[PDB]
Amino acid sequence: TILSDVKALGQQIWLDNLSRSLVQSGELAQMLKQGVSGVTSNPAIFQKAFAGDALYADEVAALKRQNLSPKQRYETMAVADVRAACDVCLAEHESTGGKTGFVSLEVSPELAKDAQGTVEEARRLHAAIARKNAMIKVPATDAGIDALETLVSDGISVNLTLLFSRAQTLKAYAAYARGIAKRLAAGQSVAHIQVVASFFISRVDSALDATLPDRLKGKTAIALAKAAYQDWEQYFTAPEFAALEAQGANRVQLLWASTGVKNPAYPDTLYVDSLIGVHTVNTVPDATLKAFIDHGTAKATLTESADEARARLAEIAALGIDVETLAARLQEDGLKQFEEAFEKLLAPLV
């Protein structure tokens, strides 16, 4: 079980897919037996599930005879799938005292710039799921980071997504800390609040590799992740956070997302093999999970050769590539794609 070797190195592997049949077939439970320890979804994942999974047909027909919006029909079916996956993951969650075994459901992409509307929908979905091991997924726009602070102060666990920027990630940590501080000032618990920061990998290489010289192709995303991990080590060890951790606060954990390899010239396990380190998560598509179980390597690679990663990022800046601008552009493109998938999902539910 290579996933056990990864766990021993301090990283969780989650499945970047969710559907009704994934659960009802027993496939998810069988993955957990191999060492998978969580599940992520997003609007594109759900659009594909609803389009291809036979198990929705009866419920769709029933819901079409009710007075509901298409979005309400979607939410009814997706919440049920999330609850079912949470129950499959509950033993894992309990075995670590609530530190693992999460399933993520994303709010509507229409809300990405609306902090108050995001808070309201996140609270509603949190209440609808009614599972201690559910996370609400929120894009890390400025409004999403505003919402993160509020939701953390409400005691809600959050998966902050579409991060491509080290600066934006550090802003998210600061908002998390403000929410935790608020709870401590009100004498509230913090020990069960878990937050992950989903930092995207392959899309960075896909955006840049054509413009980069041969020596740097396929290097930027891993280099950026290695630097982000070092930022995390700094932030969460500083005296400010240390004082919160001493009162029971959990650190945010980095979660590597978009770790399926899109370029056939690269090894199919490149992102998983290259980003293993302590106190992190990697969420993988099913084909990548299978490839990693088949021929992946479990080694402590995330903290290897950190200076080389910095040298590469400096060379990329010197070539006139601004990774901050790229991050804003990738976050926008990702929101657009999620909006398009969500609209596509809703159309047949009308």
mmCIF file of C-alpha atoms in Angstrom:
data_model
loop_
_atom_site.group_PDB
_atom_site.id
_atom_site.type_symbol
_atom_site.label_atom_id
_atom_site.label_comp_id
_atom_site.label_asym_id
_atom_site.label_seq_id
_atom_site.Cartn_x
_atom_site.Cartn_y
_atom_site.Cartn_z
ATOM 1 C CA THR A 1 0.000 0.000 0.000
ATOM 2 C CA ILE A 2 1.970 2.979 -1.300
ATOM 3 C CA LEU A 3 -0.670 5.292 0.176
ATOM 4 C CA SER A 4 0.346 4.036 3.624
ATOM 5 C CA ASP A 5 3.925 5.065 2.850
ATOM 6 C CA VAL A 6 2.650 8.511 1.865
ATOM 7 C CA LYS A 7 0.666 8.755 5.100
ATOM 8 C CA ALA A 8 3.855 7.877 6.992
ATOM 9 C CA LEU A 9 5.485 10.895 5.307
ATOM 10 C CA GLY A 10 2.667 13.096 6.637
ATOM 11 C CA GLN A 11 0.506 13.587 3.547
ATOM 12 C CA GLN A 12 -3.094 12.601 2.950
ATOM 13 C CA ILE A 13 -4.313 11.479 -0.464
ATOM 14 C CA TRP A 14 -7.898 12.479 -1.289
ATOM 15 C CA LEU A 15 -10.047 11.568 -4.303
ATOM 16 C CA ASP A 16 -10.840 14.475 -6.646
ATOM 17 C CA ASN A 17 -14.194 13.090 -7.754
ATOM 18 C CA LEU A 18 -17.685 12.565 -6.360
ATOM 19 C CA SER A 19 -20.803 10.928 -7.775
ATOM 20 C CA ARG A 20 -23.729 8.861 -6.563
ATOM 21 C CA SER A 21 -22.350 5.681 -8.130
ATOM 22 C CA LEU A 22 -18.863 6.259 -6.670
ATOM 23 C CA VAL A 23 -20.456 5.746 -3.265
ATOM 24 C CA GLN A 24 -23.215 3.237 -3.997
ATOM 25 C CA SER A 25 -20.888 0.933 -5.968
ATOM 26 C CA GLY A 26 -18.629 0.549 -2.936
ATOM 27 C CA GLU A 27 -15.770 2.081 -4.932
ATOM 28 C CA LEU A 28 -15.187 4.909 -2.449
ATOM 29 C CA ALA A 29 -15.130 2.536 0.528
ATOM 30 C CA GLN A 30 -12.630 0.315 -1.325
ATOM 31 C CA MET A 31 -10.398 3.350 -1.980
ATOM 32 C CA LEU A 32 -10.419 4.257 1.721
ATOM 33 C CA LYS A 33 -9.213 0.732 2.475
ATOM 34 C CA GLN A 34 -6.144 1.528 0.327
ATOM 35 C CA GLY A 35 -5.400 4.695 2.301
ATOM 36 C CA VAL A 36 -7.463 7.407 0.583
ATOM 37 C CA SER A 37 -8.692 9.696 3.358
ATOM 38 C CA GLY A 38 -11.019 12.312 1.861
ATOM 39 C CA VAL A 39 -12.946 13.528 -1.155
ATOM 40 C CA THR A 40 -13.221 16.784 -3.093
ATOM 41 C CA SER A 41 -15.834 17.978 -5.573
ATOM 42 C CA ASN A 42 -16.482 21.084 -7.639
ATOM 43 C CA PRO A 43 -19.135 22.171 -10.173
ATOM 44 C CA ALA A 44 -17.378 20.524 -13.117
ATOM 45 C CA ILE A 45 -17.162 17.214 -11.238
ATOM 46 C CA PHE A 46 -20.865 17.411 -10.447
ATOM 47 C CA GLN A 47 -21.810 18.370 -14.006
ATOM 48 C CA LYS A 48 -20.056 15.248 -15.275
ATOM 49 C CA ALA A 49 -21.590 13.069 -12.553
ATOM 50 C CA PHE A 50 -25.136 14.252 -13.257
ATOM 51 C CA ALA A 51 -24.633 13.846 -17.031
ATOM 52 C CA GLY A 52 -23.323 10.284 -16.888
ATOM 53 C CA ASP A 53 -24.556 8.526 -13.725
ATOM 54 C CA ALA A 54 -27.664 6.353 -14.098
ATOM 55 C CA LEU A 55 -28.518 6.561 -10.403
ATOM 56 C CA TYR A 56 -29.881 10.125 -10.612
ATOM 57 C CA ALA A 57 -32.695 9.401 -13.073
ATOM 58 C CA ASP A 58 -35.464 8.447 -10.640
ATOM 59 C CA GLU A 59 -34.745 11.359 -8.312
ATOM 60 C CA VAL A 60 -34.599 13.848 -11.185
ATOM 61 C CA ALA A 61 -38.026 12.663 -12.353
ATOM 62 C CA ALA A 62 -39.403 12.987 -8.824
ATOM 63 C CA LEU A 63 -37.905 16.430 -8.268
ATOM 64 C CA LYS A 64 -39.266 17.693 -11.599
ATOM 65 C CA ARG A 65 -42.739 17.115 -10.161
ATOM 66 C CA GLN A 66 -41.980 19.437 -7.232
ATOM 67 C CA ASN A 67 -42.032 23.217 -7.049
ATOM 68 C CA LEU A 68 -38.283 23.788 -7.027
ATOM 69 C CA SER A 69 -35.717 25.833 -8.894
ATOM 70 C CA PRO A 70 -33.163 23.903 -10.963
ATOM 71 C CA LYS A 71 -30.550 24.972 -8.405
ATOM 72 C CA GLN A 72 -32.647 23.526 -5.577
ATOM 73 C CA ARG A 73 -32.968 20.263 -7.508
ATOM 74 C CA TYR A 74 -29.189 20.151 -7.975
ATOM 75 C CA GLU A 75 -28.575 20.935 -4.310
ATOM 76 C CA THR A 76 -30.968 18.236 -3.097
ATOM 77 C CA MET A 77 -29.148 15.571 -5.109
ATOM 78 C CA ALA A 78 -25.626 16.853 -4.390
ATOM 79 C CA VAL A 79 -26.228 17.209 -0.647
ATOM 80 C CA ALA A 80 -27.437 13.603 -0.578
ATOM 81 C CA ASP A 81 -24.287 12.459 -2.374
ATOM 82 C CA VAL A 82 -22.096 14.458 0.031
ATOM 83 C CA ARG A 83 -23.886 13.025 3.065
ATOM 84 C CA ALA A 84 -23.415 9.502 1.684
ATOM 85 C CA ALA A 85 -19.701 10.070 1.046
ATOM 86 C CA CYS A 86 -19.286 11.618 4.495
ATOM 87 C CA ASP A 87 -20.775 8.506 6.069
ATOM 88 C CA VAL A 88 -18.349 6.295 4.104
ATOM 89 C CA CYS A 89 -15.489 8.523 5.363
ATOM 90 C CA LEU A 90 -16.702 8.812 8.970
ATOM 91 C CA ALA A 91 -14.608 5.974 10.437
ATOM 92 C CA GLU A 92 -11.481 7.549 8.934
ATOM 93 C CA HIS A 93 -12.459 10.957 10.347
ATOM 94 C CA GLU A 94 -13.058 9.544 13.828
ATOM 95 C CA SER A 95 -9.897 7.417 13.793
ATOM 96 C CA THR A 96 -7.724 10.570 13.750
ATOM 97 C CA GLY A 97 -9.844 12.557 16.193
ATOM 98 C CA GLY A 98 -11.511 14.534 13.433
ATOM 99 C CA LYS A 99 -8.402 15.559 11.508
ATOM 100 C CA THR A 100 -9.040 13.625 8.260
ATOM 101 C CA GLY A 101 -11.892 12.074 6.311
ATOM 102 C CA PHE A 102 -13.479 15.232 4.870
ATOM 103 C CA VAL A 103 -15.777 15.636 1.869
ATOM 104 C CA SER A 104 -15.977 19.061 0.175
ATOM 105 C CA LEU A 105 -18.980 20.704 -1.516
ATOM 106 C CA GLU A 106 -18.476 24.004 -3.370
ATOM 107 C CA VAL A 107 -20.873 26.955 -3.195
ATOM 108 C CA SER A 108 -22.313 28.360 -6.406
ATOM 109 C CA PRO A 109 -19.631 29.996 -8.603
ATOM 110 C CA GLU A 110 -22.046 32.909 -9.114
ATOM 111 C CA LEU A 111 -21.249 34.023 -5.547
ATOM 112 C CA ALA A 112 -17.466 34.193 -5.932
ATOM 113 C CA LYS A 113 -17.214 38.005 -5.569
ATOM 114 C CA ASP A 114 -20.044 38.297 -3.007
ATOM 115 C CA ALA A 115 -18.804 37.714 0.536
ATOM 116 C CA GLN A 116 -22.183 37.987 2.269
ATOM 117 C CA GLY A 117 -23.946 35.777 -0.268
ATOM 118 C CA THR A 118 -21.138 33.245 0.039
ATOM 119 C CA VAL A 119 -21.455 33.202 3.834
ATOM 120 C CA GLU A 120 -25.210 32.728 3.568
ATOM 121 C CA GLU A 121 -24.981 29.866 1.084
ATOM 122 C CA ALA A 122 -22.127 28.197 2.974
ATOM 123 C CA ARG A 123 -24.098 28.295 6.222
ATOM 124 C CA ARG A 124 -27.159 26.894 4.461
ATOM 125 C CA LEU A 125 -25.260 24.036 2.805
ATOM 126 C CA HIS A 126 -23.377 23.321 6.048
ATOM 127 C CA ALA A 127 -26.729 22.946 7.806
ATOM 128 C CA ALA A 128 -28.228 20.873 4.964
ATOM 129 C CA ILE A 129 -25.356 18.382 4.867
ATOM 130 C CA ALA A 130 -25.433 17.957 8.657
ATOM 131 C CA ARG A 131 -22.162 16.013 8.849
ATOM 132 C CA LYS A 132 -19.190 16.832 11.052
ATOM 133 C CA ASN A 133 -16.779 15.760 8.292
ATOM 134 C CA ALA A 134 -18.111 18.038 5.551
ATOM 135 C CA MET A 135 -16.182 21.058 4.298
ATOM 136 C CA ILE A 136 -17.701 23.901 2.323
ATOM 137 C CA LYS A 137 -15.530 24.856 -0.654
ATOM 138 C CA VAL A 138 -15.124 28.571 -1.420
ATOM 139 C CA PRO A 139 -12.965 30.211 -4.127
ATOM 140 C CA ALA A 140 -10.087 32.245 -2.709
ATOM 141 C CA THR A 141 -11.068 35.562 -4.241
ATOM 142 C CA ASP A 142 -10.798 38.584 -1.960
ATOM 143 C CA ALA A 143 -14.508 38.150 -1.166
ATOM 144 C CA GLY A 144 -13.963 34.465 -0.466
ATOM 145 C CA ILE A 145 -11.220 35.321 2.014
ATOM 146 C CA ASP A 146 -13.612 37.772 3.700
ATOM 147 C CA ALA A 147 -16.172 34.958 3.881
ATOM 148 C CA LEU A 148 -13.532 32.539 5.189
ATOM 149 C CA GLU A 149 -12.941 34.657 8.277
ATOM 150 C CA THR A 150 -16.682 34.772 8.997
ATOM 151 C CA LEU A 151 -17.236 31.057 8.394
ATOM 152 C CA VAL A 152 -14.273 30.095 10.590
ATOM 153 C CA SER A 153 -15.672 32.321 13.353
ATOM 154 C CA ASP A 154 -18.959 30.393 12.904
ATOM 155 C CA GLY A 155 -17.083 27.126 13.474
ATOM 156 C CA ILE A 156 -17.477 25.896 9.871
ATOM 157 C CA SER A 157 -14.715 23.902 8.170
ATOM 158 C CA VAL A 158 -13.728 25.287 4.770
ATOM 159 C CA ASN A 159 -11.811 24.230 1.675
ATOM 160 C CA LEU A 160 -10.519 27.439 0.071
ATOM 161 C CA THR A 161 -9.977 26.748 -3.648
ATOM 162 C CA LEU A 162 -8.581 28.208 -6.878
ATOM 163 C CA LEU A 163 -5.370 29.387 -5.219
ATOM 164 C CA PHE A 164 -2.509 30.026 -7.637
ATOM 165 C CA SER A 165 -0.703 32.798 -5.712
ATOM 166 C CA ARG A 166 1.566 32.632 -2.687
ATOM 167 C CA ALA A 167 0.455 36.132 -1.657
ATOM 168 C CA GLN A 168 -3.240 35.240 -1.875
ATOM 169 C CA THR A 169 -2.600 32.064 0.122
ATOM 170 C CA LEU A 170 -0.891 34.076 2.890
ATOM 171 C CA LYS A 171 -3.882 36.437 2.947
ATOM 172 C CA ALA A 172 -6.098 33.396 3.483
ATOM 173 C CA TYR A 173 -4.007 32.245 6.439
ATOM 174 C CA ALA A 174 -4.363 35.690 8.039
ATOM 175 C CA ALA A 175 -8.147 35.598 7.619
ATOM 176 C CA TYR A 176 -8.254 32.118 9.153
ATOM 177 C CA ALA A 177 -6.238 33.365 12.128
ATOM 178 C CA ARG A 178 -8.612 36.316 12.606
ATOM 179 C CA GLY A 179 -11.577 33.939 12.662
ATOM 180 C CA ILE A 180 -9.872 31.653 15.179
ATOM 181 C CA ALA A 181 -8.927 34.644 17.342
ATOM 182 C CA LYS A 182 -12.574 35.770 17.350
ATOM 183 C CA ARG A 183 -13.709 32.379 18.606
ATOM 184 C CA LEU A 184 -11.091 32.302 21.326
ATOM 185 C CA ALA A 185 -12.124 35.790 22.456
ATOM 186 C CA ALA A 186 -15.717 34.505 22.795
ATOM 187 C CA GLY A 187 -14.659 31.400 24.725
ATOM 188 C CA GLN A 188 -15.660 29.152 21.846
ATOM 189 C CA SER A 189 -14.100 25.890 20.733
ATOM 190 C CA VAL A 190 -11.630 25.774 17.855
ATOM 191 C CA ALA A 191 -10.258 22.223 18.045
ATOM 192 C CA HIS A 192 -12.681 20.794 15.434
ATOM 193 C CA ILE A 193 -12.303 23.544 12.819
ATOM 194 C CA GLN A 194 -10.299 22.343 9.811
ATOM 195 C CA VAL A 195 -9.362 24.426 6.767
ATOM 196 C CA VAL A 196 -7.424 23.444 3.647
ATOM 197 C CA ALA A 197 -5.938 25.755 1.017
ATOM 198 C CA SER A 198 -6.304 24.130 -2.427
ATOM 199 C CA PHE A 199 -3.304 25.311 -4.430
ATOM 200 C CA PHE A 200 -3.503 24.368 -8.087
ATOM 201 C CA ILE A 201 -0.648 22.661 -9.917
ATOM 202 C CA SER A 202 -1.060 21.484 -13.502
ATOM 203 C CA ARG A 203 -2.828 24.608 -14.761
ATOM 204 C CA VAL A 204 0.293 26.678 -14.088
ATOM 205 C CA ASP A 205 2.444 24.453 -16.306
ATOM 206 C CA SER A 206 -0.283 24.269 -18.953
ATOM 207 C CA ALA A 207 -0.372 28.071 -19.079
ATOM 208 C CA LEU A 208 3.382 28.627 -19.297
ATOM 209 C CA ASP A 209 5.142 25.615 -20.800
ATOM 210 C CA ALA A 210 4.816 26.777 -24.428
ATOM 211 C CA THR A 211 6.499 30.109 -23.623
ATOM 212 C CA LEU A 212 9.246 28.586 -21.422
ATOM 213 C CA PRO A 213 12.644 27.336 -22.576
ATOM 214 C CA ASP A 214 13.154 23.580 -22.538
ATOM 215 C CA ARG A 215 15.041 23.573 -19.229
ATOM 216 C CA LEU A 216 12.063 25.112 -17.391
ATOM 217 C CA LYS A 217 9.151 23.298 -19.040
ATOM 218 C CA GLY A 218 7.181 21.375 -16.450
ATOM 219 C CA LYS A 219 9.027 23.006 -13.542
ATOM 220 C CA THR A 220 7.079 26.119 -12.548
ATOM 221 C CA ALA A 221 4.101 24.588 -10.767
ATOM 222 C CA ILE A 222 6.199 22.331 -8.538
ATOM 223 C CA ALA A 223 8.627 25.172 -7.779
ATOM 224 C CA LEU A 224 5.733 27.444 -6.811
ATOM 225 C CA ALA A 225 4.279 24.722 -4.562
ATOM 226 C CA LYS A 226 7.621 24.164 -2.834
ATOM 227 C CA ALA A 227 7.892 27.881 -2.117
ATOM 228 C CA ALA A 228 4.269 28.012 -0.934
ATOM 229 C CA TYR A 229 5.014 25.174 1.496
ATOM 230 C CA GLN A 230 7.917 27.152 2.904
ATOM 231 C CA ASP A 231 5.615 30.155 3.299
ATOM 232 C CA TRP A 232 3.291 27.858 5.272
ATOM 233 C CA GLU A 233 6.135 26.685 7.503
ATOM 234 C CA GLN A 234 6.942 30.310 8.291
ATOM 235 C CA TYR A 235 3.420 31.571 8.870
ATOM 236 C CA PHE A 236 2.268 28.781 11.175
ATOM 237 C CA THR A 237 5.469 28.768 13.264
ATOM 238 C CA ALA A 238 5.486 32.545 13.877
ATOM 239 C CA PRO A 239 4.762 33.634 17.468
ATOM 240 C CA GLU A 240 1.315 34.974 16.541
ATOM 241 C CA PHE A 241 0.003 31.643 15.307
ATOM 242 C CA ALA A 242 1.953 29.732 17.962
ATOM 243 C CA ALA A 243 -0.128 31.488 20.616
ATOM 244 C CA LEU A 244 -3.320 30.320 18.882
ATOM 245 C CA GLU A 245 -2.022 26.775 18.419
ATOM 246 C CA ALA A 246 -1.287 26.688 22.156
ATOM 247 C CA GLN A 247 -5.022 27.312 22.725
ATOM 248 C CA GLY A 248 -6.023 24.373 20.516
ATOM 249 C CA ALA A 249 -6.117 25.907 17.045
ATOM 250 C CA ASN A 250 -5.336 23.726 14.048
ATOM 251 C CA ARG A 251 -3.089 24.937 11.256
ATOM 252 C CA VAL A 252 -4.527 25.341 7.790
ATOM 253 C CA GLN A 253 -3.029 22.666 5.536
ATOM 254 C CA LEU A 254 -1.981 23.088 1.936
ATOM 255 C CA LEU A 255 -3.822 20.823 -0.497
ATOM 256 C CA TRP A 256 -2.347 20.227 -3.941
ATOM 257 C CA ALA A 257 -5.100 20.224 -6.574
ATOM 258 C CA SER A 258 -5.119 19.841 -10.352
ATOM 259 C CA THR A 259 -2.499 17.117 -9.918
ATOM 260 C CA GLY A 260 -3.501 15.023 -12.913
ATOM 261 C CA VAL A 261 -0.833 15.342 -15.572
ATOM 262 C CA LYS A 262 -2.109 16.996 -18.748
ATOM 263 C CA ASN A 263 1.078 16.841 -20.844
ATOM 264 C CA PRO A 264 1.837 13.322 -22.163
ATOM 265 C CA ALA A 265 5.583 14.065 -22.188
ATOM 266 C CA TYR A 266 5.623 14.118 -18.367
ATOM 267 C CA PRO A 267 5.323 11.076 -16.063
ATOM 268 C CA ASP A 268 1.686 10.507 -15.098
ATOM 269 C CA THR A 269 2.642 10.519 -11.380
ATOM 270 C CA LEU A 270 4.800 13.658 -11.625
ATOM 271 C CA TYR A 271 2.731 15.910 -9.413
ATOM 272 C CA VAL A 272 1.962 13.316 -6.750
ATOM 273 C CA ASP A 273 5.536 11.988 -6.601
ATOM 274 C CA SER A 274 7.030 15.485 -6.453
ATOM 275 C CA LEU A 275 4.924 17.163 -3.723
ATOM 276 C CA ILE A 276 4.923 14.752 -0.758
ATOM 277 C CA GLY A 277 5.554 16.451 2.571
ATOM 278 C CA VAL A 278 4.307 16.655 6.124
ATOM 279 C CA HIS A 279 0.978 18.277 7.031
ATOM 280 C CA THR A 280 -0.324 18.441 3.452
ATOM 281 C CA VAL A 281 -3.026 16.878 1.265
ATOM 282 C CA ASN A 282 -3.012 15.964 -2.424
ATOM 283 C CA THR A 283 -6.389 15.443 -4.104
ATOM 284 C CA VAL A 284 -6.057 13.263 -7.194
ATOM 285 C CA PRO A 285 -8.349 12.295 -10.080
ATOM 286 C CA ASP A 286 -9.149 8.602 -10.268
ATOM 287 C CA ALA A 287 -6.828 7.889 -13.214
ATOM 288 C CA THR A 288 -3.932 9.520 -11.372
ATOM 289 C CA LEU A 289 -4.782 7.640 -8.165
ATOM 290 C CA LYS A 290 -4.624 4.381 -10.112
ATOM 291 C CA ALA A 291 -1.333 5.360 -11.752
ATOM 292 C CA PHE A 292 0.191 6.253 -8.382
ATOM 293 C CA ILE A 293 -0.917 2.998 -6.749
ATOM 294 C CA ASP A 294 0.486 1.153 -9.781
ATOM 295 C CA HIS A 295 3.895 2.816 -10.099
ATOM 296 C CA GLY A 296 4.140 5.908 -7.904
ATOM 297 C CA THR A 297 6.989 6.644 -5.519
ATOM 298 C CA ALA A 298 6.611 7.658 -1.857
ATOM 299 C CA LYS A 299 9.525 9.898 -0.853
ATOM 300 C CA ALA A 300 9.799 13.195 1.041
ATOM 301 C CA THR A 301 10.132 15.338 -2.070
ATOM 302 C CA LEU A 302 8.239 18.527 -1.172
ATOM 303 C CA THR A 303 11.065 19.811 1.059
ATOM 304 C CA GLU A 304 13.867 18.559 -1.205
ATOM 305 C CA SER A 305 15.927 21.088 -3.166
ATOM 306 C CA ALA A 306 14.052 24.161 -2.008
ATOM 307 C CA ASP A 307 16.850 26.462 -3.171
ATOM 308 C CA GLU A 308 16.590 25.093 -6.715
ATOM 309 C CA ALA A 309 12.873 25.874 -6.673
ATOM 310 C CA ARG A 310 13.647 29.482 -5.719
ATOM 311 C CA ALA A 311 16.297 29.722 -8.431
ATOM 312 C CA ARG A 312 13.763 28.562 -11.001
ATOM 313 C CA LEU A 313 11.148 31.067 -9.839
ATOM 314 C CA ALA A 314 13.758 33.822 -10.105
ATOM 315 C CA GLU A 315 14.645 32.709 -13.631
ATOM 316 C CA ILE A 316 11.068 32.750 -14.642
ATOM 317 C CA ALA A 317 10.633 36.269 -13.293
ATOM 318 C CA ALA A 318 13.770 37.300 -15.215
ATOM 319 C CA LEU A 319 12.213 35.927 -18.424
ATOM 320 C CA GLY A 320 9.413 38.461 -17.989
ATOM 321 C CA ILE A 321 6.795 36.079 -16.579
ATOM 322 C CA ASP A 322 4.832 37.565 -13.663
ATOM 323 C CA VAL A 323 3.399 34.691 -11.637
ATOM 324 C CA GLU A 324 1.178 37.072 -9.641
ATOM 325 C CA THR A 325 -0.581 38.250 -12.796
ATOM 326 C CA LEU A 326 -0.790 34.635 -13.934
ATOM 327 C CA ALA A 327 -2.477 33.646 -10.669
ATOM 328 C CA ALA A 328 -5.176 36.301 -11.046
ATOM 329 C CA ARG A 329 -5.765 35.194 -14.643
ATOM 330 C CA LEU A 330 -5.961 31.500 -13.753
ATOM 331 C CA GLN A 331 -8.349 32.213 -10.876
ATOM 332 C CA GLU A 332 -10.647 34.152 -13.207
ATOM 333 C CA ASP A 333 -10.474 31.473 -15.915
ATOM 334 C CA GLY A 334 -11.230 28.826 -13.305
ATOM 335 C CA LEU A 335 -14.286 30.693 -12.034
ATOM 336 C CA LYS A 336 -15.559 31.100 -15.600
ATOM 337 C CA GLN A 337 -15.134 27.376 -16.262
ATOM 338 C CA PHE A 338 -16.953 26.505 -13.041
ATOM 339 C CA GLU A 339 -19.761 28.937 -13.958
ATOM 340 C CA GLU A 340 -20.130 27.341 -17.370
ATOM 341 C CA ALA A 341 -20.211 23.842 -15.859
ATOM 342 C CA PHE A 342 -22.803 24.922 -13.290
ATOM 343 C CA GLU A 343 -25.029 26.472 -15.962
ATOM 344 C CA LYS A 344 -24.671 23.272 -18.005
ATOM 345 C CA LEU A 345 -25.644 21.175 -14.971
ATOM 346 C CA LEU A 346 -28.736 23.259 -14.244
ATOM 347 C CA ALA A 347 -30.181 23.347 -17.767
ATOM 348 C CA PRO A 348 -31.540 19.749 -17.784
ATOM 349 C CA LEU A 349 -32.992 20.190 -14.272
ATOM 350 C CA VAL A 350 -35.390 22.883 -15.366
#
